[PDB]
Amino acid sequence: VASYDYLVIGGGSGGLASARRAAELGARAAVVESHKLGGTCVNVGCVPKKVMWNTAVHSEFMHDHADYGFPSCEGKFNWRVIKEKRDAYVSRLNAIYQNNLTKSHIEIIRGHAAFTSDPKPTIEVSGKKYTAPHILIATGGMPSTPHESQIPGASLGITSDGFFQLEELPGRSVIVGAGYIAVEMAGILSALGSKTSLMIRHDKVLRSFDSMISTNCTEELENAGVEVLKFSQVKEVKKTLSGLEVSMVTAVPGRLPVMTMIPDVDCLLWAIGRVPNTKDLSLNKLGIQTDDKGHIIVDEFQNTNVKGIYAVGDVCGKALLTPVAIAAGRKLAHRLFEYKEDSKLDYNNIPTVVFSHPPIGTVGLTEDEAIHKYGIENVKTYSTSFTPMYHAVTKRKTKCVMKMVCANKEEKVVGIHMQGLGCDEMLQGFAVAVKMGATKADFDNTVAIHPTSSEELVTLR
Amino acid sequence: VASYDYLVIGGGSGGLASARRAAELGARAAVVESHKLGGTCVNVGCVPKKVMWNTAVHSEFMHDHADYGFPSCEGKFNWRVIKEKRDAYVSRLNAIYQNNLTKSHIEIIRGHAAFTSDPKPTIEVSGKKYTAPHILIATGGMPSTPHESQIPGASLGITSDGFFQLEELPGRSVIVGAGYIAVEMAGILSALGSKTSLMIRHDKVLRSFDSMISTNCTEELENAGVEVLKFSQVKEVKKTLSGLEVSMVTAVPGRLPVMTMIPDVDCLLWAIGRVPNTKDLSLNKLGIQTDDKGHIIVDEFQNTNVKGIYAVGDVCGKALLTPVAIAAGRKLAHRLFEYKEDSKLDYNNIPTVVFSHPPIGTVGLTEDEAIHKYGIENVKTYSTSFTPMYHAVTKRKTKCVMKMVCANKEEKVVGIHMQGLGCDEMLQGFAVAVKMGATKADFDNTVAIHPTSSEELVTLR
Numbered sequence: 001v002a003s004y005d006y007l008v009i010g011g012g013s014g015g016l017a018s019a020r021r022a023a024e025l026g027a028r029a030a031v032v033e034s035h036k037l038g039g040t041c042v043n044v045g046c047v048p049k050k051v052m053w054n055t056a057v058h059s060e061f062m063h064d065h066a067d068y069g070f071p072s073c074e075g076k077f078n079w080r081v082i083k084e085k086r087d088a089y090v091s092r093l094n095a096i097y098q099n100n101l102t103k104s105h106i107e108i109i110r111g112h113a114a115f116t117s118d119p120k121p122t123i124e125v126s127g128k129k130y131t132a133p134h135i136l137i138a139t140g141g142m143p144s145t146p147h148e149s150q151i152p153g154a155s156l157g158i159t160s161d162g163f164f165q166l167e168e169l170p171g172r173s174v175i176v177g178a179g180y181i182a183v184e185m186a187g188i189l190s191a192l193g194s195k196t197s198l199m200i201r202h203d204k205v206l207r208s209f210d211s212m213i214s215t216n217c218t219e220e221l222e223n224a225g226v227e228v229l230k231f232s233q234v235k236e237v238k239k240t241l242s243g244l245e246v247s248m249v250t251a252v253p254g255r256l257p258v259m260t261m262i263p264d265v266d267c268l269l270w271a272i273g274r275v276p277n278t279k280d281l282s283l284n285k286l287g288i289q290t291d292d293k294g295h296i297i298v299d300e301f302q303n304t305n306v307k308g309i310y311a312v313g314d315v316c317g318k319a320l321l322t323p324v325a326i327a328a329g330r331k332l333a334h335r336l337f338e339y340k341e342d343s344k345l346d347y348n349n350i351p352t353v354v355f356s357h358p359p360i361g362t363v364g365l366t367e368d369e370a371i372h373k374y375g376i377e378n379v380k381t382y383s384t385s386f387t388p389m390y391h392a393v394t395k396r397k398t399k400c401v402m403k404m405v406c407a408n409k410e411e412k413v414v415g416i417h418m419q420g421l422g423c424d425e426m427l428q429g430f431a432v433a434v435k436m437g438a439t440k441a442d443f444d445n446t447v448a449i450h451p452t453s454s455e456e457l458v459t460l461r
Numbered sequence: 462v463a464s465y466d467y468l469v470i471g472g473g474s475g476g477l478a479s480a481r482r483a484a485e486l487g488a489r490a491a492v493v494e495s496h497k498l499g500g501t502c503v504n505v506g507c508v509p510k511k512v513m514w515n516t517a518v519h520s521e522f523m524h525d526h527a528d529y530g531f532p533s534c535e536g537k538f539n540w541r542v543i544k545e546k547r548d549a550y551v552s553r554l555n556a557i558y559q560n561n562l563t564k565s566h567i568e569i570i571r572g573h574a575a576f577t578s579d580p581k582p583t584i585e586v587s588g589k590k591y592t593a594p595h596i597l598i599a600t601g602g603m604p605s606t607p608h609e610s611q612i613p614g615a616s617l618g619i620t621s622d623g624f625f626q627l628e629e630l631p632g633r634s635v636i637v638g639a640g641y642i643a644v645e646m647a648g649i650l651s652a653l654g655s656k657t658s659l660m661i662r663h664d665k666v667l668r669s670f671d672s673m674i675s676t677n678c679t680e681e682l683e684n685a686g687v688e689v690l691k692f693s694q695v696k697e698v699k700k701t702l703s704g705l706e707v708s709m710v711t712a713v714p715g716r717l718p719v720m721t722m723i724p725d726v727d728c729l730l731w732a733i734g735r736v737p738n739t740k741d742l743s744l745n746k747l748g749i750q751t752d753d754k755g756h757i758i759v760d761e762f763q764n765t766n767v768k769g770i771y772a773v774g775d776v777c778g779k780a781l782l783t784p785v786a787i788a789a790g791r792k793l794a795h796r797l798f799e800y801k802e803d804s805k806l807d808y809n810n811i812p813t814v815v816f817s818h819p820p821i822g823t824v825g826l827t828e829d830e831a832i833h834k835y836g837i838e839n840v841k842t843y844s845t846s847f848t849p850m851y852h853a854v855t856k857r858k859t860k861c862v863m864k865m866v867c868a869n870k871e872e873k874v875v876g877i878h879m880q881g882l883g884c885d886e887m888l889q890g891f892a893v894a895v896k897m898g899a900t901k902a903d904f905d906n907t908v909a910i911h912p913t914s915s916e917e918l919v920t921l922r
């Protein structure tokens with residue numbers, strides 16, 4: 001039984017970030033990883049997605065070429081070219097991350113970890129045992145898929161994992177779900193030329209975002225050529241002569257349900273959520289608490305119910321974002337190895353960007369959330385809607401919507417929501433201001449930057 | 462003699478903004494304008510410039526087309542197409558601004574105003590007299606040009622005003638100066654295909670910006686195909702058979718001076734500063750104080766030396782930016798018509814973006830300024846340099862540089878400087894945080910947005 005100061009299960013964002021900070025603090029740490037370092041972010045998430053987004057962004061801009069005085073650009077996108085360059089870039093990152101571990105003197109134990117029956121918390125990887133007074137579980141999650149028992153043929157569809165394996169642009173694609181991945185992938189497939197349908201259970205995407213965003217985002221998708229199938233769900237899938245055939249039921253409220261077949265589908269993409277990866281950990285041998293989805297339960301300090309065992313990142317099922325896993329893993333290293341007992345991540349006011357077209361940025365409370373928290377009489381919003389000056393000369397148009405949610409008499413800024421060109425890079429600094437407790441006067445007292453889209457946020461009336 | 466509550470001389474950014482806020486407060490105001498409403502910003506500045514920048518941005522992106530899996534875009538930019546659409550857009554804005562005035566019940570007196578000999582401050586426009594207990598001078602400035610006495614043939618060159626009149630892309634262009642307009646125009650002309658030279662008196666552009674910026678910006682220009690002629694200045698210009706011929710003297714320190722002729726020049730652009738427009742105002746009839754460049758002298762409240770006469774914007778020669786003229790004009794309306802005696806614009810921490818390629822954003826003190834203000838022992842900077850993920854797949858590359866200047870033990874953020882893709886829309890929110898007095902801990906305690914360029918500012922170490 002090899003002993004360490006810190007044992008980290010999972011070499012993804014949260015696991016790596018925690019291990020590296022702990023090692024800086026003098027801990028002798030090892031990282032157990034059964035696949036590729038970098039985990040979801042590097043291999044099948046953030047990184048490869050953003051590359052594909054930049055590619056779709058090129059497609060849109062190229063529609064505006066002639067309006068801008070250039071000669072029309074003629075045609076066919078070649079999926080394989082960018083796919084190969086994307087994969088290579090991912091290979092570069094894996095090599096970098098591995099080097100980051102070695103330079104920090106962190107040991108990398110390759111293989112699949114599982115807890116043992118042993119009294120003191122101990123894991124087994126490939127026959128060998130390892131132990132530590134502090135063990136971090138940061139095993140992430142996986143894409144959720146329907147059971148064949150509920151949706152026969154569900155297994156003919158792919159997930160975001162399978163999207164990253166595609167070698168050619170699918171001719172006809174159908175995306176199921178109404179959250180981040182659905183919106184992102186539909187926007188990428190569509191811009192690149194796939195005839196795309198987005199199938200959602202209600203009438204709008206991103207129903208947990210401020211209602212201004214869910215409305216605007218749904219419209220922007222339609223305006224971009226994405227067919228949004230409202231109030232619809234898959235009843236069954238089957239492999240026909242040439243592609244898949246999707247049976248769906250559409251149940252608009254106030255109407256009779258109607259069954260439709262979608263034929264000749266090349267790609268069926270399930271974008272219905274993620275499940276925690278705790279199934280094969282043998283948690284129950286230590287009696288570690290999980291919810292009924294398999295998530296590990298933790299307190300505000302990332303403690304599990306068992307002493308000396310912690311969990312961070314997607315496996316805990318809260319705020320499933322790379323930078324959250326990293327921040328939580330780092331605060332945890334400071335608490336453990338620098339004895340900062342108050343060291344923990346504040347889960348309020350975490351900013352997030354949805355890489356749609358145009359992109360969405362949001363931080364803090366939606367209008368309804370602030371209304372519930374402070375009361376209607378105490379909530380004031382400001383908003384604007386305009387067409388970016390970029391489109392002053394184009395036939396194609398997109399809009400920019402911004403909303404500021406303020407609370408109390410002081411008009412404390414409790415939420416910012418926006419969609420528009422440039423919104424991916426605009427959010428970070430406002431998120432700093434919101435975190436510091438800015439009021440509307442603080443915004444208003446900042447001189448604007450002209451001509452930009454960002455200046456609108458500081459001149460709301 | 463028609464009397465008003467407020468008389469505004471000049472219908473540009475500062476003048477319009479002040480008049481409109483005063484009218485909201487109940488003032489009976491009139492705006493005197495001798496040319497087009499919207500002044501410099503709308504007609505020959507901010508707006509038409511940004512349209513041309515977006516156009517150059519299209520040119521660059523189109524170089525990356527093939528790398529992104531698309532087929533190569535072939536060619537020739539057509540200046541006249543975008544020029545016509547730009548002019549139309551400017552026509553739209555003029556009509557909008559005029560409507561904004563009318564809806565506010567502001568009178569527009571068309572013509573050129575000049576002060577009279579009259580005791581109580583009174584102006585004359587086209588034979589008629591007008592007076593008010595509060596008169597605002599917001600007449601802006603003009604491009605500065607060399608005298609034929611110092612540089613013979615200087616008058617064969619154009620200014621930024623003349624740039625906006627060009628109907629075709631000049632084949633060969635030479636830009637003189639090393640400030641905002643020089644950098645902007647060189648970057649636009651070059652991206653659009655003109656064979657461009659930038660002639661600067663020293664070795665770097667933007668020598669008043671943080672030294673990291675001036676260095677990086679000079680290199681980015683060279684990497685983009687702009688020929689930077691260091692330690693050089695124009696000795697004379699002459700009209701040859703086919704274009705202009707520029708005589709220059711190059712005096713590298715530690716070297717003998719050398720004279721060079723630049724032949725076949727299509728466009729010679731003077732970008733050497735601006736002069737205030739006070740010459741024809743008859744200021745001296747009231748004894749209003751000006752500096753030796755003709756700028757009007759004002760106090761912290763925009764007061765001139767004469768009671769009931771104020772000045773804002775470019776004519777005062779300080780912080781020559783649209784949003785500064787607007788903010789100063791507005792604070793001034795609140796002081797005058799809402800009796801807010803403490804109402805004034807803080808000239809510290811005004812953010813500014815230079816529309817270069819890539820764009821520059823800066824707010825607060827440069828490293829040297831903070832060193833002078835707090836002392837070397839009390840100044841700490843953090844910086845980063847990286848290649849944006851956008852270029853992970855391109856043969857063409859640009860860099861992103863960021864520097865944070867902190868002061869004292871608390872590490873108060875006193876300056877932010879950056880250049881890179883997205884930096885035009887990224888600055889605004891950090892400028893809010895800087896204005897509020899954020900410290901580095903405030904930045905560091907804000908969860909990042911991944912994957913973006915902006916996240917780098919909150920993870921500096």
Ligand SMILES: Cc1cc2nc3c(=O)[nH]c(=O)nc-3n(C[C@H](O)[C@H](O)[C@H](O)COP(=O)(O)OP(=O)(O)OC[C@H]3O[C@@H](n4cnc5c(N)ncnc54)[C@H](O)[C@@H]3O)c2cc1C
Nearest residue numbers: 010012013014034039040045113139140313314320321322
């Ligand atoms: C398509 C997609 C796009 C996304 N885009 C973004 C975005 O733009 N921005 C953003 O902020 N977030 C984004 N996310 C979410 C973000 O990727 C995740 O929140 C983040 O990767 C979660 O990190 P983690 O450390 O919890 O887990 P992961 O990164 O999943 O790491 C878990 C690791 O543990 C390993 N492992 C699991 N079990 C074991 C075991 N028993 N033994 C050994 N090793 C094991 C796994 O192989 C894996 O490498 C995206 C996600 C997806 C799926």
Ligand SMILES: Cc1cc2nc3c(=O)[nH]c(=O)nc-3n(C[C@H](O)[C@H](O)[C@H](O)COP(=O)(O)OP(=O)(O)OC[C@H]3O[C@@H](n4cnc5c(N)ncnc54)[C@H](O)[C@@H]3O)c2cc1C
Nearest residue numbers: 471473474475495500501506574600601774775781782783
């Ligand atoms: C090429 C260029 C690009 C720029 N780009 C930017 C940028 O991107 N962002 C930015 O923030 N700033 C930019 N600036 C600077 C910005 O345009 C100026 O700071 C701003 O316009 C100054 O406003 P003002 O109200 O002082 O004057 P102006 O807008 O010049 O208004 C003065 C007005 O007074 C009128 N006038 C003058 N004398 C009289 C008289 N006697 N009687 C009647 N009317 C009179 C003039 O016709 C004019 O309309 C740019 C400037 C230029 C030249």
Ligand SMILES: NC(=O)C1=CN([C@@H]2O[C@H](COP(=O)(O)OP(=O)(O)OC[C@H]3O[C@@H](n4cnc5c(N)ncnc54)[C@H](OP(=O)(O)O)[C@@H]3O)[C@@H](O)[C@H]2O)C=CC1
Nearest residue numbers: 177178179180181182201207271272273274320353354355
């Ligand atoms: N840009 C970024 O930061 C990105 C972050 N991520 C992270 O990864 C997480 C996982 O993303 P994703 O998988 O999109 O999950 P989400 O939970 O974001 O989205 C799924 C949505 O699909 C709908 N849905 C649920 N079950 C079904 C079903 N059986 N059939 C049809 N629709 C269904 C629901 O919306 P409704 O109730 O309206 O039907 C549900 O909320 C994200 O939430 C985010 O935390 C992922 C991608 C990008």
Ligand SMILES: NC(=O)C1=CN([C@@H]2O[C@H](COP(=O)(O)OP(=O)(O)OC[C@H]3O[C@@H](n4cnc5c(N)ncnc54)[C@H](OP(=O)(O)O)[C@@H]3O)[C@@H](O)[C@H]2O)C=CC1
Nearest residue numbers: 638639640641642643662668732733734735781814815816
């Ligand atoms: N994006 C934005 O916000 C923009 C804002 N503006 C505003 O308008 C102002 C006017 O812009 P611009 O006209 O560029 O003025 P600036 O004062 O910005 O730049 C001029 C520079 O050229 C050099 N120079 C001065 N005299 C000469 C000469 N005789 N020969 C050669 N070079 C000379 C000097 O630099 P050195 O000492 O190194 O030689 C000088 O500082 C700006 O400063 C800014 O306030 C303008 C454009 C864009």
